[PDB]
Every structure is written in structure tokens, then in C-alpha cells.
């Protein structure tokens, strides 16, 4: 019955690299690419490099999905010096890598119910260590945090899941972007003028071959279709309390007992 699976992508840093990066400058995209979430699910199931290639990509790729951007993390560039040789020689490889800092994403993959159930079961039981696109970016929130459900369209699924405040008084985005695989509608229906190309459909994964896809963005407005959640915890530590009083009734009984 539940035809949608949900993924929560939040960490201190994250990096879903774009198409224009396998040189020494290795940038990132503003939203999780389809190959990134597909690889996360592939690790959650835990199949090999070529076992993904052997008839596993299009079963997860025909699942037209959406990615919902809660807060926009900023682009931080890390200065990475690869040692190259430390057969070996004193040469240092130079690189700069882009990361998304302080961003939270929700990815809703819509497909047939049994695949969604298997995906949620493998998400609760990751047979391999899963991360946020780069191995040095482990998640800060559970990827299987939000339970699966049944929804007719991607918009209903991505608007049903609430937006969680980390703390009590933080600025929330009044406008909330959502990026989805382009629904073709009826047969034919050439893509609209806002449909951008994105080379993130995997068909082989060693070496990575990516196929283009059409990607369309809508905007959601919080407070009418996306609702906030409770705080559900405490932030500051505030060590325990001194300053015993001298008028409460529980004081005088112990005071008289000690006498």
C-alpha cells in the first residue's frame, strides 16, 4: 500500500557533485542529484559495484522522485591537498572541493509498494555505511526517520512531511523549493521551456556513466501546505540546580528529623 519512500538527508556537510567536476576542481550541486540518492539506496540494500549495473538502475530510476529543500546550506570550499606520492616522488596534488553546509533535504521516491517496503527495510538496516554523497559526510539525522506512506503524486508526498525545527527561535524559509523529475503527462508532451537538463541518471556505475534527465522546480509556501513541528528536546545543557529554599513543607520534616 505505501507507494512513496522518504529519505532525510541532513548533516554538518554534504556534497552532491554536478556534471562539470572530475578535474581537480570538484564542485557540488544545490540539490541532491538522482545518482546520489540512488547510490545511497544501493548502499542501503548493499549490492556491489557491478551488481547495481546488472539490472538494478532502471528499477530505482523509473521512480519519478522529488527533492524538497528545507533550508539552503551555503557553499563552503575546502582546500584539499592530495599527497599523490608520500614509484613515489615529492609532488603534491592540489584541489578545492565544494560542500553544502547546514542544509536539510527530503527525497520522496514514488514507485510500486513492494519496492518502497524493501527500500524502507534496507534503510533501517544499512549493510554498508551510508553517507551524504561523500564518504567524509555522515548523516546527522536518521535517513529512515520519516515513515513511508501512500500518496498519489509527488507534490502531496512532499507536502505531507512536516518541516522540523532544530531549535525554538530560528528563521525558517517562508518559501521552500522542490525539484522533481519531469512528469511527462500524456504521451508526447515535449518538455516545457523551464525544463533543465541534468546528467544524473545512472546506467553504469564503474566507470560512472550518467544519462541526462529533465528537472523541474516548484515552490511551496510554509504555513498553508508545509507545517512546522515541535522542538522535541532541549538545546542548552544548564547544569543542575542549587539554592534550596527555606519555606517549603518538605524542608521542615527533614530538618526536624535530623534534630
Amino acid at each position: 500500500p505505501p507507494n512513496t519512500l522518504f529519505l532525510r538527508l541532513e548533516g554538518a556537510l554534504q556534497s552532491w557533485g554536478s556534471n562539470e567536476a572530475k578535474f581537480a576542481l570538484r564542485r557540488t550541486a544545490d540539490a541532491p542529484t538522482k545518482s546520489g540518492v540512488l547510490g545511497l539506496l544501493c548502499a542501503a540494500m548493499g549490492i556491489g559495484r557491478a551488481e547495481a549495473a546488472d539490472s538494478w538502475l532502471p528499477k530505482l530510476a523509473n521512480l519519478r522522485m522529488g527533492v524538497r529543500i528545507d533550508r539552503p546550506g551555503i557553499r563552503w570550499w575546502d582546500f584539499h591537498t592530495v599527497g599523490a606520492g608520500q614509484k613515489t616522488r615529492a609532488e603534491t596534488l592540489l584541489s578545492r572541493r565544494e560542500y553544502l553546509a547546514d542544509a536539510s533535504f527530503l527525497v520522496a521516491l514514488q514507485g510500486e509498494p513492494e519496492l518502497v517496503a524493501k527500500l524502507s527495510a534496507a534503510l533501517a538496516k544499512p549493510v554498508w555505511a551510508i553517507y551524504l554523497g561523500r564518504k567524509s559526510c555522515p548523516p546527522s539525522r536518521p535517513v529512515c526517520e520519516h515513515p513511508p506512506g501512500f500518496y498519489n503524486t509527488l507534490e502531496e508526498a512532499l507536502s505531507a512531511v512536516p518541516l522540523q525545527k532544530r531549535w525554538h527561535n530560528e528563521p525558517l524559509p517562508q518559501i521552500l523549493p522542490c525539484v522533481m523529475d519531469w512528469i511527462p503527462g500524456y504521451d508526447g508532451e515535449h518538455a516545457p521551456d523551464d525544463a533543465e537538463i541534468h546528467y544524473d541518471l545512472p546506467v553504469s556505475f564503474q566507470p560512472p556513466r550518467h544519462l541526462p534527465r529533465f528537472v523541474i522546480r516548484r515552490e511551496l509556501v510554509v504555513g498553508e501546505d508545509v507545517q512546522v513541528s515541535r522542538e522535541t528536546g532541549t538545546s542548552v545543557w544548564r547544569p543542575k540546580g542549587t539554592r534550596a529554599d527555606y519555606n517549603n513543607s518538605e524542608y521542615k520534616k527533614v530538618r526536624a528529623e535530623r534534630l
Binding site: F23, W77, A84, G188, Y199, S204, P208, P212
Partner: protein, 443 residues
């Protein structure tokens, strides 16, 4: 085996219905309104579009019929590109495509492509090894089209391409292949002698466009081994027997040849305008982001000017043989006049960005690093600015003052780190840190 560009599939496109496919030259020729060029490498996409533009120029030179817009290309181009079947051939007994005089020097197939690392002055690369894995036929063709456009220096001894070191490449973009070809159609009276004919006669200078856009600085023969590969491991698509190596020599580009590439961007002194990208944040350079701002003064003044359309920029940053980074960008444009000094100021944003980076917290010395924490927040503000690059360029409601106030929150939260005191003087110095912004400069 016998491979032809006309019948065998080598072009990566995506159909507007949404089905990506590898298709041949005829398929992308006579459809031309249902597909869009889809290459993972941006400059591969630009080189394939340049080849298609040159083919359209040849078809117009031999048929004299303009491609009218919103309606696919004239149907007289296919029989003119069809009857010379032996002509666009990689194999066979006769003329060959982008191949030339006999050869002796042999180099691996990894250097024809640029995105995959080559045999440097090292032994280890980005998990590649020469003479073991090779490219497919489509990859070989798209690497051969990289030669007239994106050939760099080979250590100051090996010459560059026909348009010097590979400059910024600017063109007009549309959602369709018909709009791809139509928006970049402007021809010249003299066409030239392109290199898909045989050994062209040099004669005099002023080649035109068709000879200059397809200049061949390198050669390819390749020695075919007995059988070949079983499973591909370099391209990614598992294919049949592939290539292993090739043979590359150089041709010295002569002196003179007063010639301008239609899509290139040329400086005030006539030299090529480069992409200012390098990871090396030097004394005089501050690394921010893709430098869409750089090739704007020359292109919007001399070649193309103000025109309603999309501006696709391809920038292959290089320094001698160091392939630094390739990026592309799409800018909307209407052509609402041109303010001269403001667009000139926008043409070099890296100077003001480096000047803002070099200003220290408290100090007067000029060889200092300034504030290195600013250098990690300039990239994000530059990326936020670069989305509205069309409104920045035409100056409708976006200007230098309206876009550099996007640095404000990053400046506040960096000043919190740099002045971590709850005092009066720390707050005042934080406020002085807030108003820091890239004052523009005249050149």
C-alpha cells in the same frame, strides 16, 4: 570495422519527449527539432555544436538556403551530405576524417581527450593507465572535435591551436537544435576551405570562418591490433573492441592570419581572453567561482553585441599544459542597450574580489593575506549572485550595489568569529567589518 559518421551512432542527444539516445549524423540532421544536445562534458557539447554549425555553413555554401526558425532545417542538406559516403569516414581506402600526412610518433589515446588525465610527468593519475583502457568511437570523435577549439600549449615547445590558447567561447543558445543552429547562423562572404576536404592549399591569409573553425593542429592514425577489447572499462558504456592508442604530431601555426573566431572573445590588444579559474589562491588572485563576468566587455561590444537570446559560455581554464577546470553557464538576455563603464567594471570582478580579500582586519601592509575567512564566503555569495547574471548584465533592477549586499549575512557571521568578544569595541569593529564591500575599479 568500417565506421562512418553518417550511419553509425556517435551523437549523445536527449529527445524532447525524454528519451536519451546515441544517434548518427543523419538522425540529428533531419529531425533537428525533437532533440537537444546532451553531453556530460560542456565543451564536448560546444565542439559538437561547432561541427554542426560548420556542416550547416557548408550546406548553405553548396545550396544557398537559410534555416528559417520555428520549423526544422531545409531538406536539401541531407542529399548533399549523403552522396559523399566514403568522405566522412574513419576507415576505408581513401580520404579520412580529421586525419592527415604519414606519421611516426605514437602517443596514447588518453591525451586526445582532456578530461581524463594523461601521461604526465608522473606514473599515477586519477585511476587511469595508458595502453590498457581506451575510448569508444563516439568518444574518439568528440575528442577529435576538441582539437580545433580546445588545444592548449604543450610546454612552450608544442604550439597551440589556431585561436591561440583556448579562450572563452560564447554563443547563442535555445531549447531546440533548430534554435541552436538558427541563433548562431551569421555567415561571412568568404567561407574558406575546411579540413574535411583533403590537404588544403594554404595560398594567402584571411581564411574566413569555415577554414578557421576546423583547423587541424594534430593528426590521428592509430595502429589496429589483432582483435581488441572484450568489455569497456574507460568510457563507462560496455562496448565491443575499442581503441588503445593513436599517433599525434603538431603543425606550426604560421605568423599573421588576421582572423577572428565568431564565438571567441578577444582582449583590447587582440590576445585571447582566458578563464580566470585556478584553485591556487595567489597573492593577486582570490578564488571565488565560475567567471561568467570576465568575457562580457569584448563579446557585448564587438562580436554579437546586444541581442535577444541565451548566452552560453564555455570556459576552459588553462596555464600552459595544466588543464585546470571546465565550466559552462547560460545567461538570459534581451539586449536592453549597453552601459559602457558599468559593464567594463563587471568585466573584471576578480580584481575587486582580490582587493576585498587582501584588506586586513587591522593593518596597512599590502603583501599580507588579509582575511582568509572571507575567501571561504566569497564563493557562496558569488554563486548566489551568478544566478541572476542576466539582470546583472543588462542592469534592469540588479546592479553592483544590489548584488554585493548579498555578502551581508556571511559578513556578520564571519565577524562574529573574528571578533568573539561581547564588548563595545568588538561590536564597533564588527560593524566596520560589516560595511566591507568590493568597491569597483575603472579598468
Amino acid at each position: 570495422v568500417m565506421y562512418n559518421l553518417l550511419c553509425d551512432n556517435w551523437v549523445n542527444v536527449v529527445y524532447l519527449s525524454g528519451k536519451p539516445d546515441r544517434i548518427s549524423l543523419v538522425q540529428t540532421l533531419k529531425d533537428a527539432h525533437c532533440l537537444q544536445l546532451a553531453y556530460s562534458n560542456p565543451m564536448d557539447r560546444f565542439t559538437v555544436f561547432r561541427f554542426l554549425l560548420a556542416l550547416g555553413y557548408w550546406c548553405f555554401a553548396n545550396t544557398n538556403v537559410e534555416p528559417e526558425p520555428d520549423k526544422p532545417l531545409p531538406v536539401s542538406w541531407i542529399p548533399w551530405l549523403e552522396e559523399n559516403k566514403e568522405y566522412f569516414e574513419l576507415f576505408g581506402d581513401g580520404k579520412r576524417f580529421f586525419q592527415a600526412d604519414p606519421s611516426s610518433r605514437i602517443r596514447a589515446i588518453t591525451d586526445l581527450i582532456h578530461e581524463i588525465p594523461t601521461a604526465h610527468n608522473l606514473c599515477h593519475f586519477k585511476h587511469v593507465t595508458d595502453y590498457i583502457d581506451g575510448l569508444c568511437e563516439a568518444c574518439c570523435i568528440k575528442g577529435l572535435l576538441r582539437l580545433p577549439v580546445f588545444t592548449t600549449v604543450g610546454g612552450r615547445g608544442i604550439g597551440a591551436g589556431i585561436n591561440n590558447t583556448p579562450p572563452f567561447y560564447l554563443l547563442w543558445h535555445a531549447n531546440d537544435l533548430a534554435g541552436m543552429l538558427a541563433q548562431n547562423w551569421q555567415p561571412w562572404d568568404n567561407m574558406g576551405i575546411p579540413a574535411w576536404l583533403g590537404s588544403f592549399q594554404k595560398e594567402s591569409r584571411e581564411v574566413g570562418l569555415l577554414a578557421g573553425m576546423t583547423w587541424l593542429p594534430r593528426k590521428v592514425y592509430l595502429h589496429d591490433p589483432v582483435p581488441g577489447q572484450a568489455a569497456c572499462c574507460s568510457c563507462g558504456l560496455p562496448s565491443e573492441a575499442l581503441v588503445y592508442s593513436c599517433s599525434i604530431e603538431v603543425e606550426p601555426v604560421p605568423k599573421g592570419l588576421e582572423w577572428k573566431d565568431p564565438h571567441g572573445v578577444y582582449t583590447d590588444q587582440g590576445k585571447s581572453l582566458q578563464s580566470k579559474i585556478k584553485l591556487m589562491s595567489n597573492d593577486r588572485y582570490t578564488f571565488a567561482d565560475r567567471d561568467w563576468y570576465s568575457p562580457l566587455f569584448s563579446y557585448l561590444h564587438a562580436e554579437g553585441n546586444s541581442r535577444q537570446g541565451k548566452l552560453w559560455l564555455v570556459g576552459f581554464a588553462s596555464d600552459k599544459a595544466k588543464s585546470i577546470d571546465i565550466w559552462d553557464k547560460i545567461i538570459e538576455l534581451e539586449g536592453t542597450d549597453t552601459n559602457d563603464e558599468l559593464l567594463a567594471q563587471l568585466a573584471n570582478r576578480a580584481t575587486a574580489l582580490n582587493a576585498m580579500r587582501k584588506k586586513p582586519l587591522r593593518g596597512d601592509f599590502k603583501k599580507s593575506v588579509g582575511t582568509p575567512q572571507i575567501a571561504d564566503i566569497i564563493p557562496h555569495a558569488e554563486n548566489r549572485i551568478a544566478i541572476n547574471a542576466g539582470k546583472m548584465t543588462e542592469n534592469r533592477g540588479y546592479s553592483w550595489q544590489d548584488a554585493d549586499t548579498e555578502y551581508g549575512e556571511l559578513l556578520t557571521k564571519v565577524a562574529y568569529s573574528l571578533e568573539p568578544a561581547q564588548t563595545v569595541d568588538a561590536r564597533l569593529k564588527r560593524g566596520n567589518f560589516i560595511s566591507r564591500k568590493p568597491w569597483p575599479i575603472i579598468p
